[PDB]
């Protein structure tokens, strides 16, 4: 599979050659300096392919090859390790090849090459490298190499079930006195146990040790326990029966944690806690959420403190995020959060009351974080103030304004009909103040579409201003927002704008027109229908018409006004281009039934086109 | 060689472009005029139908058991 050697089966000569080169290099050592292995990366890269090449020629059977391979990585690494290391430290030497083995492994999974045993040989070799540094880069290296090495060995080649680590063992013995902790920390850092749907009894003992770790006299000791705890809880689990009992102290520890502050990962574990939170056994879960609410009172208390030293945006986000994990499991239990939301609103109001943010970062975060909020009349009352600021904010920068503006419209959702109790009207005026050519900006196509869309949403049942809205905006928009870059956005916007309220436009618009009707737009539309066949909107190479036109053709209305043009139009797109059963029986009858007389005008042409259209549509 | 029982049945079902498949009688009499035949067609053949059901070839339509009308799964 992998290209290691030329022609067929060449892969083999190169991998042997590398070992031979090492032997030649092995006899006399000219350099005697570190970082010799790193220079061999070009060679290292060549080597895995060569080994693959030998197997590839031989195409040794996977069971035999796997057995040989299982013996082999350990046998060659070991033979290579027993000879190469002496004539070349051990830990550094293990890593480049270990990383290289990693490189081979990623390529290997797709190939399906069979390997096994990388992990077993190492535990002994793991003994060879101390991996203990009090405060040097040494620690850095310990982090990089040991933890990563253990994880890879456990989860990719070795496929180990259970292991006992001596190095792990000293630390358990004699309490936490002296080194065991120094050793234990390294051990824990370097590994996470991997099991599927299994409770682990060692993990239960680890929870008791976690309580002792909570009783750690020092924070650094607490930290080394903390990384393991944070991942450990973050790690998904099959049972965790005693976990709930274990949790209160952890929660109690969480309490001390707020006072304790310190670690970000511990705060992050709170994030892990939310994940851990959906769990199983949700009904008691609610009572935990109420205790979490008191802890949230602390969080609310916590943010200023977090604000004082090192910002913990995640923690602020997390209180909100945690509720969702409770959202994860639904027992239909009555929610007492409402009151909490009220507290959040009061907290939210304080930020809002200032009405300003120098950073202009927290404000957006408060908005997106705060998007899920009560729609109650007080919650309803909050939006105009939130929206009022929104009008100011959207106008200064169009690019900055649009994501929020879409959010500002979503905020507009609570107001709903009546323009949020005349606020929608304020938004339109503000938009007019900020609407123009300035607006075209990267993503403007989208932006203008959004603005118009927003209007349409407000006008769920706002028929009267609608003729003026589509017509008034368009005349101003074509000159002001018309752009060569925005044509793709514009076609869809124009098509969608034309697509929306066509009947309302067709009859109501025809019936009542201010400054008449948009004859130029109508003329443009007539030209546009023909134009669409001739020229692809938005430079999409005809992608848009086929996809919507499928479901859309039966539902959509283009047949009566300009059928000949439409009839001429459909085939060209198709040439360029290349549920149903109930609907099919229903559609012929349904479409025919509501206006039998109306179909009649396009009755022969319509029917002939329809049969062809149906075949093209269903072909 | 000897034609497979399943083959015969597949050909008989597929020869009738239909939705409800067919009453076994149709396939059976089809067998009577189209193939070498013997006194034990009903027992051995019927059991064969039963066994091709056991193999999960077919989905029930009308009736219950080898007396009914049935369709292929898709």
């Amino acid at each position: 599979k992998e290209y290691n050697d030329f022609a067929e089966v060449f892969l083999k000569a190169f991998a042997v050659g590398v070992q031979q080169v090492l032997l030649k290099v092995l006899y006399q050592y000219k350099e005697k300096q570190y970082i010799a292995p790193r220079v061999l990366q070009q060679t290292l890269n060549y080597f895995n392919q060569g080994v693959s090449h030998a197997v590839t020629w031989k195409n040794l059977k996977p069971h035999i090859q796997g057995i040989i391979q299982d013996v082999i990585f350990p046998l060659m690494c070991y033979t290579d390790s027993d000879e190469d290391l002496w004539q070349e430290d051990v830990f550094e030497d293990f890593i480049s090849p270990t990383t290289a083995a990693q490189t081979l492994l990623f390529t290997s999974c797709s190939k399906r090459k069979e390997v096994l045993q990388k992990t077993m040989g190492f535990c002994y070799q793991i003994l060879t490298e101390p991996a203990a540094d009090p405060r040097k880069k040494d620690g850095a290296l310990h982090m990089i190499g040991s933890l990563a090495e253990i994880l890879l060995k456990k989860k990719i080649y070795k496929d180990q079930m259970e292991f006992m680590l001596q190095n792990h063992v000293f630390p358990l013995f004699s309490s936490e006195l002296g080194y065991m902790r120094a050793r234990a920390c390294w051990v824990l850092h370097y590994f996470c146990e991997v099991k599927f749907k299994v409770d682990q009894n060692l993990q239960t003992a680890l929870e008791l040790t976690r309580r002792c770790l909570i009783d750690d006299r020092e924070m650094p000791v607490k930290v080394e326990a903390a990384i393991a705890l944070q991942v450990l809880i973050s790690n998904q689990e099959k049972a965790k029966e005693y976990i709930v009992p274990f949790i209160r102290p952890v929660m109690q520890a969480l309490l001390h944690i707020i006072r304790e502050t310190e670690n970000d990962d511990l705060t992050n574990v709170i994030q892990k806690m939310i994940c851990e939170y959906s769990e199983e056994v949700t009904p008691i879960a609610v009572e935990m959420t109420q205790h979490l609410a008191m802890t949230f009172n602390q969080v609310i208390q916590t943010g200023p403190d977090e604000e004082g030293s090192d910002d913990k945006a995640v923690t602020a986000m997390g209180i909100l995020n945690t509720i969702d994990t409770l959202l994860s499991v639904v027992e239909d239990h009555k929610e007492i959060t409402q009151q909490l939301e009220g507290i959040c609103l009061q907290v939210i109001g304080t930020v809002l009351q200032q009405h300003v943010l120098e950073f202009y970062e927290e404000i957006f975060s408060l908005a997106h974080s705060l998007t899920c909020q009560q729609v109650s009349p007080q919650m309803w009352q909050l939006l105009p103030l939130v929206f009022d600021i929104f009008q100011q904010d959207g106008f200064d920068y169009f690019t900055d304004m649009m994501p929020l503006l879409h959010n500002y419209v979503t905020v507009d959702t609570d107001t709903l009909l009546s323009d949020t109790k005349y606020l929608e009207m304020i938004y339109s005026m503000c938009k007019k103040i900020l609407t123009g050519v300035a607006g075209e900006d990267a993503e403007c196509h989208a932006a203008k579409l959004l603005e118009v869309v927003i209007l349409q949403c407000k006008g769920r049942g706002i028929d009267q201003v609608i003729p003026l809205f589509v017509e008034a905006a368009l005349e101003r928009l074509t000159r002001e927002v018309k752009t060569s870059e925005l044509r793709t956005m514009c076609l869809q916007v124009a098509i969608a704008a034309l697509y929306y309220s066509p009947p309302l436009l067709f009859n109501t618009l025809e019936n009542l027109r201010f400054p008449n009707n948009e004859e130029p737009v109508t003329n443009h539309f007539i030209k546009q229908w023909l134009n669409d066949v001739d020229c692809f909107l938005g430079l999409h190479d005809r992608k848009i018409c086929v996809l919507g036109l499928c479901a859309l053709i039966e539902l959509e209305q283009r047949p009566q006004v300009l059928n000949q043009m439409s009839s001429q139009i459909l085939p060209a797109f198709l040439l360029l281009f290349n549920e149903y059963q109930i609907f099919k029986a229903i559609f012929q009858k349904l479409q025919g039934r509501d206006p039998v007389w109306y179909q009649a005008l396009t009755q022969g042409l319509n029917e002939d086109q329809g049969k062809q259209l149906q075949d093209i549509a269903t072909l | 060689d000897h034609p497979k029982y399943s083959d015969m049945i597949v050909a008989a079902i597929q020869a009738e472009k239909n939705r409800a498949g067919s009453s076994r009688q149709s396939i059976q009499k089809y067998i009577k005029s189209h193939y070498k035949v013997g006194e034990n067609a009903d027992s051995q053949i019927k059991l064969s139908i039963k066994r091709l059901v056991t193999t999960g070839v077919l989905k029930q339509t009308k009736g219950v058991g080898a007396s009914g009308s049935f369709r292929l799964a898709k």
């Binding site: 089966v9 195409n59 199983e280 499991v329 | 060689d1 939705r19 189209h34 066994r51």
Partner: protein, 873 residues
């Protein structure tokens, strides 16, 4: 010839029977008819199947020196030609005269007429029959029996597969349609001719002239038919008649179907009758079948599935008037206690279901309330009835309406299952089971459990006599298992002890259940076995104590089955035995589904007896080819073990089986069994040759008859031949000879087919040579013994190899053996001529073609073989 010696002695099959005996059967039997019309006609009656002219002619003609040569192929028609009575045309016209006149109650002639189709099948066409038959149909003496009697010939004629176009006959048929519909018949039989005549003429399509007038006549037919009961099946003719309308709706406008709608109302109006009148009671049962038609009548308008013609039909528009009718139809109430049998009633239930689909507008508002109306005033029969009706309610989620209604149902239903009668709870249990699968929103896990807990232990008392319902409750519990898998989150950790003990009891109950007192209901022994299998699937890591006993129980059941198997009883038994045996197979695989290292030795142990029994009885019984074969498969599935003793036991039976002549063809079955035991042991090859040579010797004669059992045998024998490793060189020479012998053996044509697969037979020879090659030195000087044979082996192969090598259709195995061929034959032949080197590219193109493959592997070895192939100088 005379005295029946030829008539009887000739009956035994002999070579060229159609050709020589055919003169006797077709010509002599056929010959008798001109001299005496009576003897030949007499002839049809004693041995209808055994007619020398036709029965003898029919099968002996199909296999012949020329499979499809008219002059050479058919002697039955020629032989009969000499005798006027014997003639194929005489067969048609005389078949008409004799067949019509001699109805004789059930008719022998009809089969002969049908054979008429079959025997005439060799000939391209026969036109003699229609003119006289047409004349007979239009004959002046229009006797009531005669008018109805005609078309027996027409019906079977329609039945025949061969398609020919006749129109004048169609015109006469139209006249018959109008006159028959027009004529009044006081005897059910004549109209039965109308109905059967119609359906056979209905065929798949109709060439008859279009007009919707006759269908209106069908409507009328109901009214007079209302007066007389006739034949339940005669009534069936009426229901079928409408069903004929059901199949085809040519004109929507033409098919106003007003009469059908009107008829439904009158029938609906005459719901049973006041006081249960007898004409009406029979009408109620026939009405039930007709009711099956009724669902169809309702079904005809607004069908859910795509239809050629779909319309309101004046009913959906009238559904408003008809909205009430569905509730009204409930006019008929039954207090009968039955759980597993539907008969005409299932049609009732399905009809209710179609209304359920068609409920449309106003169904949702009505649904919450309908239950309440029943709920507010529920009688003992009514609550039980409410349950059955609810079962009708099952279809249609009715989500807004259903939860409140369902939620109260949990409370309402719960105070109901404790009804004292064993049968009343059972009614609650079955309907409850359907609801249980049906409902997951409501939760009576706790509510469900007492009954389940109670059902497992308490409901064993009523189990012995008609305890199938208790079993049905158990089935409901199984559904509970499925529902738990799909109803609400979790709750899979409790009740295991309860399950272990109850299931522990179930299994023992099953055997007597299968032979238990009859309820004759929709309780399935096969279904029961399936339920047991599902329970086993729900089995934990270990249930071994039960399994050994289970297997023995199966052994006891097998002995009981064997007793049923040894002497049959009129075939009512034959089938009741056979299906239950199929479940016995279900037992066999089910018992061995689990596999444990500790478990396998113990299970195999006790299993030994069973396996042996299978062999004994399987070899001994000779009743079913696949049952016994399947037994071989299941027991065979016991891979590994000390099979030397067992396998050694197998060979005599296998050798004996080949020798055995119980089944005309045993090769397919034989090939499958060996192709597994053969695979298991190769260390000792001594036993196979003795039986095998004979089987091998036996195979050559057998081979001409069947094409399918040739390559497989060639491949199978190759597999035996497959060990190689420089062993069996003597056998290898014979094996090499056998491949030549196979080529030497004469071609055999079966079912007018010869050598359909060019690749398997031609390649098969390729495989066979290679097989000798592995056994025999690809250098043995006398590679080919014969001179004529030798040129191809000696020189033909090199030239042929270049062509063959460049040729394609390279099979994964022919390609691999060939890969060995290039190197080994190549080294010896290297340097023979420039041409070998020069002709190599043709081979190269084919090898490139061989390269495209799916999951191809092991180039190294093939590369090595090719290295030898090109190891040149």
């Amino acid at each position: 010839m005379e005295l029946i010696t030829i008539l009887e002695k000739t009956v035994s099959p002999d070579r060229l029977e159609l050709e020589a005996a055919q003169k006797f059967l077709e010509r002599a039997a056929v010959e008798n008819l001109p001299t005496f019309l009576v003897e030949l006609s007499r002839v049809l009656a004693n041995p209808g199947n055994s007619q020398v002219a036709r029965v003898a002619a029919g099968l002996q003609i199909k296999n012949s020196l020329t499979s499809k040569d008219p002059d050479i192929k058919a002697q039955y028609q020629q032989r009969w030609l000499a005798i006027d009575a014997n003639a194929r045309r005489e067969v048609k016209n005389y078949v008409l005269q004799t067949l019509g006149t001699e109805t004789y109650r059930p008719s022998s002639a009809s089969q002969c007429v049908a054979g008429i189709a079959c025997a005439e099948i060799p000939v391209n066409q026969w036109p003699e029959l229609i003119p006289q038959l047409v004349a007979n149909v239009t004959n002046p003496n229009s006797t009531e029996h005669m008018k109805e009697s005609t078309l027996e010939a027409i019906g079977y004629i329609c039945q025949d597969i061969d398609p020919e176009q006749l129109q004048d006959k169609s015109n006469e048929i139209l006249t018959a349609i109008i006159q028959g519909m027009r004529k009044e018949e006081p005897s059910n039989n004549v109209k039965l001719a109308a109905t059967n005549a119609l359906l056979n003429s209905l065929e798949f399509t109709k060439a008859n002239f279009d007009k919707e007038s006759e269908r209106h006549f069908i409507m009328q037919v109901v009214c007079e038919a209302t007066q007389c009961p006739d034949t339940r099946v005669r009534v069936a003719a009426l229901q079928n008649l409408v069903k004929i309308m059901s199949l085809y709706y040519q004109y929507m406008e033409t098919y106003m179907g007003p009469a059908l709608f009107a008829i439904t109302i009158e029938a609906m109006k005459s719901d049973i009758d006041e006081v249960a009148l007898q004409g009406i009671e029979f009408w109620s049962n026939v009405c039930d079948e007709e009711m099956d038609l009724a669902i169809e009548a309702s079904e005809a308008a607004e069908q859910g599935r795509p239809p050629e013609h779909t319309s309101k039909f004046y009913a959906k528009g009238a559904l408003q008037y008809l909205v009430p009718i569905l509730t009204q139809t409930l006019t008929k109430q039954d207090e009968n206690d039955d759980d597993d049998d539907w008969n005409p009633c299932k049609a009732a239930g399905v009809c209710l279901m179609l209304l359920a689909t068609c409920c449309e507008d106003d169904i949702v508002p009505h649904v919450l309330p309908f239950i309440k109306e029943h709920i507010k005033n529920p009688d003992w029969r009514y609550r039980d009835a409410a349950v059955m009706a609810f079962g009708c309610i099952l279809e249609g989620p009715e989500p807004s309406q259903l939860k409140p209604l369902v939620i109260q149902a949990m409370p309402t239903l719960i105070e109901l299952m404790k009804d004292p009668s064993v049968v009343v709870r059972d009614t609650a249990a079955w309907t409850v089971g359907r609801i249980c699968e049906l409902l997951p929103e409501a939760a009576i896990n706790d509510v469900y459990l007492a009954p389940l807990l109670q059902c497992l232990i308490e409901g064993l008392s009523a189990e012995p006599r008609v305890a199938s319902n208790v079993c049905w409750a158990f089935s409901s519990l199984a559904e509970a298992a499925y529902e738990a898998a799909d109803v609400a989150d979790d709750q899979e950790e409790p009740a295991t002890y309860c399950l272990s003990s109850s299931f522990e009891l179930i299994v023992q109950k099953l055997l007597e259940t299968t032979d238990r007192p009859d309820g004759h209901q929709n309780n399935l022994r096969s279904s029961a076995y399936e339920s047991l299998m599902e329970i086993v699937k729900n089995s934990a890591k270990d249930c071994y104590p039960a399994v050994q006993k289970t297997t023995l129980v199966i052994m006891e059941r097998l002995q009981q089955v064997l007793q049923m198997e040894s002497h049959i009883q009129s075939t009512s038994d034959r089938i009741q035995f056979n299906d239950l045996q199929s479940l016995l197979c279900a037992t066999l695989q089910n018992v061995l589904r689990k596999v444990q290292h500790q478990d396998a030795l113990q299970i195999s142990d006790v299993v030994m007896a069973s396996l042996l029994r299978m062999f004994q009885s399987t070899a001994g019984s000779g009743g079913v080819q696949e049952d016994a074969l399947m037994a071989v498969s299941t027991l065979v599935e016991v891979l590994g073990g000390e099979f030397l003793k067992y396998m050694e036991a197998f060979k005599p039976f296998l050798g004996i089986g080949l020798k055995n002549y119980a089944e005309y063809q045993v090769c397919l079955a034989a090939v499958g069994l060996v192709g597994d035991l053969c695979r298991a042991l190769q260390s000792n090859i001594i036993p196979f040759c003795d039986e095998v040579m004979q089987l091998l010797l036996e195979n050559l004669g057998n081979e001409n008859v069947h094409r399918s059992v040739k390559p497989q045998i060639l491949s199978v024998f190759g597999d035996i031949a497959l060990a190689i490793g420089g062993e069996f060189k003597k056998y290898l020479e014979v094996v090499l000879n056998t491949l030549q012998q196979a080529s030497q053996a004469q071609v055999d044509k079966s079912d007018y087919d010869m050598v359909d697969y060019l690749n398997e037979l031609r390649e098969s020879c390729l495989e066979a040579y290679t097989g000798i090659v592995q056994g025999l030195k690809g250098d043995q000087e006398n590679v080919h013994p014969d001179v004529m044979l030798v040129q191809p082996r000696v020189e033909f192969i090199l030239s042929f190899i270049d062509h063959i090598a460049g040729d394609e259709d390279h099979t994964d195995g022919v390609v691999a053996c060939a890969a060995g061929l290039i190197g080994d034959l190549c080294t010896a032949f290297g340097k023979d001529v420039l041409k070998l080197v020069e002709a190599r590219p043709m081979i190269h193109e084919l090898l490139t073609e061989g390269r495209r493959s799916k999951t191809n592997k092991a180039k190294t070895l093939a590369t090595w073989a090719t290295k030898e192939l090109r190891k040149l100088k």
